[PDB]
Design a protein around this ligand. Structure first.
Ligand code: CDL
Ligand code: PC1
Ligand code: PC1
Ligand code: 3PE
Ligand code: NDP
Ligand code: SF4
Ligand code: SF4
Ligand code: SF4
Ligand code: ZN
Lengths: 156, 178, 207, 52, 96, 48, 114, 47, 342, 56, 52
């Protein structure tokens, strides 16, 4: 009955909850939002995995940056992220969000959403196949599987 | 030619039967019961949901996903540093630096692709006159870091040495249509 | 008859040329250099003092019912002293024909608005102002349309760098999104692609 | 929409942004067996419009 | 082959490796350096010379439209061997 | 591939690897080039 | 030497317009440090207004002045209305831009730039 | 063997005929029937 | 300088600085500002973290691609330190803590860890080692943390005689434990102070100035082997400081005196929290310990920084505590705090 | 198709259409994934006589 | 090749969101009508201009 073992199992439970219930946010900027939809569609049923689009940041757990991020939109994106409550994850979807993409050298594009918010997972493509975005969601699920927070608290 | 969608309405003729039918429609909610019936029918149909990641969505040989540099069956590299791929890459994602290999051949030292700039358009593999750069089928190559998505010559060469069994067959299938 | 070249009909050329003569001799005070192209398109160039009269005539006149403003553009040619070539592409549904009216402006030489004629031009003129710096008169609400809320410059001017002068990021110190001078990890690569051999001798510029 | 994206992907390689239509025509001819699938889709799409 | 440096870093087929004093090797700490162990130069050297009885031979690589543009190679100099410019295959005049 | 198998090639891998992100044995990018400009090597002797 | 005037047939009327604009900004600053919850005083804002105004004090063509006043009124509209957030307002202060020195010698020590 | 031009061409005679017009069908009772049923139910319940 | 360390550019996110720093304690209140100021001018920052990868996200964006390199380490494992300092030319030990744990003592974090980091940095060829002690640190202080910190800087200098030691005062910022603490006393409806706040002096400094000073000492050749005292321009009495606080917070200020022999017991109780305690006996004693006078020590104006007074940067910390009635209230509505000399 | 002569009747009545003849799913009524090789044709400008680009 | 393919234009009477929705549905139906013809009559030949 070691407290370290108990804490590891408790953390497994915490992560299982926060993982099997990932409510993203209805935040789609450009084409990549269409593949987001298609990943919400019958062929790839999101809710099947526990994923549910909630429109309020105060209820969401992750935000998928699904398209190009202009300088006129970055403040709103950072504000929304700030308004999401911890634990909060972020997913960059496409090449526009990762590094500006096809509009990298433009005067009105931030060359990466990773400049305005911190990104956990990068999904490449223009657009990323909905299958790929799902692969990224599950990659995030596993990353959450590997948080080990309470073990750290107990080791402190 | 043209047609009307909501002008079909003609002059008004009304009977007791028509009035009673419209009344039943308005009082018993006929038209809504039909939507209920449709949604019911859909409940007893087979869902189009595939069981990912076990069974996957279809694709075609022409699918253009992850990039890879190939080789001749002898193991020699196909790239000759002609630079059409970076000359046309409309995202300016490719970067090349060539130099005479010790044996004298024309080969590259740098071949980098910012896969955060690639729009996955395919122009590079239709420009390459030696079928060296291709856009493979792999799309499950997401990362936890931006740096991982900045491929160099070694990464693309390893991908080519990893997918050749598939890239080559898809080419053999699609190369008559080009 | 040839399968690669494009079938060419002179009837539309004649129609548009006759209508161009019509417009030129009915608005001499404003019209300059009417012209028609190999592809069948009519282009009427004018003095900017004639914008509203010309467009109103082409909208209201009976033989000219161009009452749909398709587009409204500008074109920076830094060579000429009046850089901006403002363009009014129009459409007649009654005659299934189009037409293009052009003026010229400058950084310090504004023109009149046509929202009194075509309400479609509000946002297009706001766009011209935001992108090139041309100011319009008697515009209800002339502000920026596409650029950021504190953006300095007119980006479509050929003299404006493709990548701009500033660049945005988030700073934890101030806890805000800030604007810093541009600094790139990879510089845009300028490719000189123009062939040094004359390609179209029909457009040769005599010295 | 997913089946029509499949048409795209077959003919171009991309589901959504197919740089297929180009000055002069199209980049690449239709692959054998695509018109049949388009027919099988069109013979039924009317039913879905009717449901909606 | 993949030879290592005094620092243990592997030298790529480009001859590239970081100097022992280079700070840029932190990126490979708790990680790895991706190299391609199949050096194409050694491989194409391991292939033999294809003799021929004609003074001028062509090379499309292989597969026709799956190889490289067809080039023609002269084989008069009996001491040397003709090498394709796209591939590295060697050819020699059999009867000299 | 049990009936129509791929073609055999030396350089092809014999062990497929999955996505190895956020691990060791992952990919780190670097410059595949050598030094372009070389510095002067000062002498080991003094002027005396 | 003969051109068309935009609004002002001389520099004095343009100066009248400029003064009207200065009054508008001077009166607005407090309302927008209140509303936007800016973490600056009211004096800093008016000093910044005056500095941005002097930034273009050298002009003598009334047309340039008229266009500058138009742009200033556009910005004052964007600010009176809250179309722009505290971010765009504090962009003016450049709180993060490391200030390049005007000393020839420091510019010499850091970089090749003149 | 030999090789003719091969191309994704339609089949001889053309494809089958496609339905594109509306077919929202017609169903239900007569109205009098609905009201009679409802009234009879009310009356029986009242009794 | 090695060819890859020559500085190139204008001092932007994507430029080169010539600085390859290993920042111990980057996941804290001050380390994040340090890393921001480093990645802002284009330097390589090696950030060894023991915490969860979810607590370094706010850092992951404050540096261009490849400028931030993260690493998992452990204070007890010495190899975890060698691998970090193996390639740096600077090391910045910000490690500290305002309470002791089941597994770490003030000694452990303030003396041994810095000493091992310094041994490894010296053995590894590092040129600079910046250590952050306290201003009031002394081998004769009532607080244990200050004694331990003085011992730690002594050991760091006996192992690394060219070690820049930086001694700041009570730092104030957004994520701090000083102004937010003096604001959160309100949850207990009144402010217990010793001697009613008088007899105590505080010379607090904004954290951004401290980070600037560190980042400038990284490449200031007149600072090697020197001690510094990063202090604000104005001194205050704890009473007037807390009153100005509750003025910016617009809460009700009910101060009453309290002897230290019961306030320290209160602190012990609060410190029994197995989580991050709200206050501790050592934090108490660190409060109510007057602020040393500059006493000739070099400072921020010698590093190249003009200190920012509290009256300009307090509201951005204390607006989070106000109510809806007082949020929008400006800065000038609050009467400033009395300044003293003593 | 997996349906069983009763669910089919039910949903055909509820929807009012003969769905079993028009399914949202593709059961072997689709072109294969492995087609034979094609032999694409050539355009008109592939002659060896009376083909001068100055004409076309 | 429009002008070689027959189809009807749907037209509304009340310029409301309902008439536009109906116009869109009927334009989809007419797109089916057009696809039928494009399938049945698709000519052989090349796909891109024979001008290299
Ligand atoms: C229970 C009977 C109702 C469900 C049913 O499937 O039979 C009704 C049967 C199936 O209708 P269907 O949708 O056309 O069949 C689909 C395929 O045939 C499906 O055929 P299949 O080849 O894909 O294999 C189906 C296989 C499925 O294999 C299984 O055993 C999995 C069953 C799921 C368990 C959860 O067997 C079944 O479906 C039997 C269903 C048994 C009910 C399971 C749910 C009860 C869970 C109990 C709660 C605890 O329809 C009727 O005969 C009339 C409806 C009866 C009204 C009740
Ligand atoms: C009808 C409703 C039913 C639903 C409610 C049922 C919920 C019951 C869940 C039981 C699980 C209990 C453990 C949950 C703790 C999660 C909190 C957390 O993640 O904080 C981590 C914290 C983090 O600790 P820390 O010390 O590492 O934090 C350091 C500072 N930060 C975070 C800034 C780096 O761990 C704890 O302290 C909690 C200890 C677990 C025991 C708590 C009692
Ligand atoms: C579970 C199985 C139940 C299925 C229920 C969903 C409907 C199935 C599909 C039916 C359909 O398509 O529409 C049929 C038809 C559609 O008809 P229609 O729109 O095609 O044309 C109807 C013609 N006139 C206008 C003359 C009637 O709708 C109905 O028949 C509805 C009947 C009335 C429903 C009464 C609801 C109230 C119930 C409480 C009162 C109880 C007393 C009954 C009094 C009468
Ligand atoms: C001798 C006899 C003495 C006794 C006296 C009584 C005699 C019998 C009289 C019968 C009267 C019929 C029953 C009354 C209920 C219906 C009321 C009604 O008709 O409301 C219609 C209303 C308007 O519809 P509309 O088309 O917009 O017309 C607007 C007017 N120009 O629109 C509506 O109100 C309906 C719209 C509601 C939509 C919400 C979703 C409805 C979901 C339908 C579910 C159906 C399932 C019912 C389950 C019941 C089980 C408890
Ligand atoms: N008021 C102030 O902030 C003052 C600060 N200072 C000095 O500044 C330095 C930092 O201040 P601050 O940043 O506020 O302290 P914080 O508590 O905010 O963060 C301190 C850092 O110490 C690290 N740390 C502590 N113990 C350990 C350990 N046992 N193993 C590994 N890492 C450890 C933490 O890492 P993690 O959190 O991931 O464990 C954290 O990142 C301290 O040294 C302090 O003495 C000086 C005067 C006043
Ligand atoms: S990455 Fe491509 S598909 Fe996605 S938003 Fe950008 S341009 Fe559109
Ligand atoms: S697919 Fe297109 S964008 Fe991507 S590397 Fe090739 S040419 Fe560039
Ligand atoms: S087009 Fe092909 S051969 Fe030419 S440089 Fe690019 S990859 Fe190499
Ligand atoms: Zn060859």
């Amino acid at each position: 009955s070691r407290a370290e073992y108990v804490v590891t199992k408790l953390d497994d439970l915490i992560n299982w909850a926060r993982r099997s219930s990932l409510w993203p946010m209805t935040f789609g900027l450009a084409c990549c939002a269409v593949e987001m939809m298609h990943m919400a569609a019958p062929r790839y049923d999101m809710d099947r995995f526990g994923v549910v689009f909630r429109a309020s940041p105060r209820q969401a757990d992750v935000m998928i940056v699904a398209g190009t991020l202009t300088n006129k939109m970055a403040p709103a994106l950072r504000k929304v992220y700030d308004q999401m409550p911890e634990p909060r994850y972020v997913v960059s979807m496409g090449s526009c969000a990762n590094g500006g993409g096809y509009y990298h050298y433009s005067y009105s594009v931030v060359r990466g959403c990773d400049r305005i918010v911190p990104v956990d997972i990068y999904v490449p493509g223009c657009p990323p196949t909905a299958e790929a975005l799902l692969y990224g969601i599950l990659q995030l699920q596993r990353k959450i599987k590997r948080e080990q927070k309470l073990k750290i608290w107990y080791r402190r | 030619t043209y047609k009307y969608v909501n002008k079909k309405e003609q002059e008004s003729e009304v009977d007791m039967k028509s009035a009673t039918d419209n009344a039943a429609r308005i009082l018993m909610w006929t038209e809504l019961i039909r939507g209920l019936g449709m949604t019911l029918s859909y409940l007893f149909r087979e869902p189009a949901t595939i069981n990912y990641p076990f069974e996957k969505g279809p694709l075609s040989p022409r699918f253009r996903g992850e990039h890879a540099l190939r080789r001749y069956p002898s193991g020699e590299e196909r790239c000759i540093a002609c630079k059409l791929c970076e000359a046309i890459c409309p995202a300016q994602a490719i970067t090349i630096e060539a130099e005479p290999r010790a044996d004298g051949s024309r080969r590259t030292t740098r071949y980098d692709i910012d896969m955060t700039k690639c729009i996955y358009c395919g122009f590079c593999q239709e420009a390459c006159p030696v079928d060296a750069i291709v856009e493979g089928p792999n799309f499950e190559f997401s990362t936890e870091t931006h740096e991982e998505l900045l491929y160099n010559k070694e990464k693309l060469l390893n991908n080519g040495d990893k997918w050749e069994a598939e890239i080559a067959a898809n080419i053999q299938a699609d190369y008559l249509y080009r | 008859k040839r399968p690669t070249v494009r079938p060419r009909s002179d009837v539309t050329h004649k129609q548009l040329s006759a209508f161009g003569e019509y417009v030129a001799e009915i608005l001499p005070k404003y019209v300059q250099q009417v012209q028609v192209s190999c592809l069948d398109e009519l282009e009427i160039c004018i003095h900017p003092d004639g914008v509203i009269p010309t467009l109103t005539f082409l909208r209201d006149h009976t033989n000219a019912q161009f009452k749909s403003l398709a587009d409204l553009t500008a074109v920076d040619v830094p060579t000429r002293q009046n850089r901006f070539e403002i363009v009014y592409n129009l459409l007649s549904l009654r005659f299934n024909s189009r037409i293009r009216v052009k003026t010229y402006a400058d950084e310090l030489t504004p023109i009149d608005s046509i929202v009194s004629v075509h309400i479609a031009a509000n946002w297009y003129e706001r766009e011209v102002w935001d992108m090139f710096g041309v100011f319009f008169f008697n515009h209800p609400d002339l502000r920026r349309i596409l650029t950021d809320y504190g953006f300095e410059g007119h980006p479509f001017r050929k003299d404006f760098p493709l990548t701009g002068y500033v660049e945005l990021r988030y700073d934890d110190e101030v806890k805000r999104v800030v604007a810093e001078p541009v600094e790139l990890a990879q510089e845009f690569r300028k490719f000189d692609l123009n062939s040094p051999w004359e390609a179209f001798p029909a457009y040769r510029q005599p010295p | 929409r997913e089946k029509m994206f499949e048409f795209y992907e077959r003919v171009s390689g991309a589901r959504m942004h197919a740089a297929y239509i180009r000055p002069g025509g199209v980049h690449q001819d239709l692959p054998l067996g695509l018109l049949d699938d388009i027919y099988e889709f069109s013979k039924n799409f009317s039913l879905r419009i009717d449901e909606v | 082959g993949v030879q290592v440096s005094p620092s243990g870093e592997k030298i790529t087929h480009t001859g590239q490796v970081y100097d022992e004093k280079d700070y840029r090797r932190v990126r490979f700490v708790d990680r790895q350096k991706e190299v391609n162990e199949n050096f194409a130069i050694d491989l194409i050297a391991q292939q033999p010379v294809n003799e021929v009885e004609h003074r001028i031979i062509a090379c499309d690589g292989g597969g026709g439209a799956l190889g490289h543009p067809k080039v023609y190679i002269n084989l008069d100099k009996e001491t040397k061997t003709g090498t394709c410019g796209y591939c590295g295959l060697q050819f020699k005049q059999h009867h000299h | 591939p049990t009936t129509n198998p791929p073609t055999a090639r030396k350089f092809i891998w014999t062990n497929h690897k999955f996505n190895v992100s956020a691990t060791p044995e992952q990919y780190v990018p670097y410059s595949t080039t050598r030094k372009k400009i070389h510095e002067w090597v000062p002498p080991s002797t003094p002027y005396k | 030497t003969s051109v068309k005037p935009i609004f002002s047939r001389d520099l004095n009327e343009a100066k009248r317009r400029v003064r009207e604009l200065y009054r508008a900004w001077y009166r607005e600053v407090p309302n927008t440090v209140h509303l936007m919850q800016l973490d600056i005083t009211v004096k800093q804002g008016r000093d910044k207004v005056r500095e941005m105004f002097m930034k273009n004090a050298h002009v003598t063509d009334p047309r340039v002045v008229d266009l500058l006043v138009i742009k200033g009124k556009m910005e004052l509209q964007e600010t009176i209305k809250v179309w722009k957030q505290r971010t765009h307002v504090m962009r003016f202060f450049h709180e993060t831009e490391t200030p390049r020195p005007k000393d020839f010698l420091s510019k010499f020590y850091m970089g090749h730039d003149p | 063997a030999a090789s003719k031009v091969k191309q994704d061409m339609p089949p001889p005679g053309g494809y089958g005929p496609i339905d594109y017009k509306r077919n929202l069908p017609r169903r239900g009772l007569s109205g009098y029937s609905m009201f009679a049923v409802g009234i009879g139910a009310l009356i029986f319940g009242y009794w | 300088l090695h060819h890859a360390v020559i500085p190139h550019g204008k001092g932007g996110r994507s430029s080169v600085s010539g600085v390859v720093a290993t920042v111990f304690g980057a996941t804290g209140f001050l380390g994040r500002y340090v890393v921001n100021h480093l990645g802002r001018m284009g330097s390589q920052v090696i950030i060894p973290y023991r915490c969860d990868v979810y607590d370094i996200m706010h850092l992951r964006l404050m540096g261009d691609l490849g400028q931030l390199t993260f690493l998992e380490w452990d204070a007890r494992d010495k190899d975890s330190i060698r691998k970090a300092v193996q390639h740096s030319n600077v090391v910045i030990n910000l490690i500290g803590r305002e309470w002791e744990t089941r597994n770490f003592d003030f000694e452990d974090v303030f003396v041994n860890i810095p000493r091992a980091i310094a041994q490894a940095s010296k053995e590894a060829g590092v040129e600079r080692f910046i250590h952050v002690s306290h201003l009031n640190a002394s081998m004769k202080s009532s607080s244990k943390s200050l004694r331990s910190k003085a011992v730690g800087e002594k050991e760091v200098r006996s192992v690394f005689p060219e070690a820049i030691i930086i001694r700041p005062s009570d730092i104030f910022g957004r994520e701090d434990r000083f102004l937010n603490h003096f604001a959160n006393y309100r949850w207990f409806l009144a402010v217990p102070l010793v001697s009613l706040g008088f007899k105590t002096v505080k010379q607090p400094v904004y954290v951004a100035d401290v980070s600037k000073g560190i980042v400038n000492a990284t490449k200031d050749p007149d600072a090697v082997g020197k001690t510094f005292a990063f202090t604000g321009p104005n001194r205050y009495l704890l009473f007037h400081l807390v009153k100005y606080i509750f003025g910016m917070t617009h809460r009700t200020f009910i101060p009453y005196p309290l002897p230290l022999f019961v306030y320290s017991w209160i602190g012990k109780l609060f410190g029994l929290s197995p989580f991050e305690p709200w206050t501790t006996k050592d934090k108490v004693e660190r409060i109510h310990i007057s602020d040393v006078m500059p006493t000739d020590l070099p400072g921020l104006e010698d590093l190249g920084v003009q200190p920012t007074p509290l009256e300009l940067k307090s509201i951005e910390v204390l607006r989070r505590h106000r109510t809806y009635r007082w949020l929008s209230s400006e800065i000038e509505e609050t009467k400033p705090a009395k300044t003293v000399n003593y | 198709a997996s349906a069983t002569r009763v669910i089919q009747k039910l949903r055909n009545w509820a929807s009012g259409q003969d769905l079993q003849a028009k399914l949202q799913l593709r059961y072997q009524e689709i072109a294969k994934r492995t087609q034979p090789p094609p032999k694409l044709p050539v355009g008109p400008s592939h002659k060896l006589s009376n083909n001068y680009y100055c004409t076309r | 090749v429009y002008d070689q393919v027959e189809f009807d234009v749907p037209i509304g009477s009340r310029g409301d969101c309902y008439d536009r929705y109906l116009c869109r549905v009927e334009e989809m139906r007419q797109s089916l009508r057009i696809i039928e013809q494009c399938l049945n009559k698709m000519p052989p030949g090349e796909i891109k201009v024979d001008d290299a």
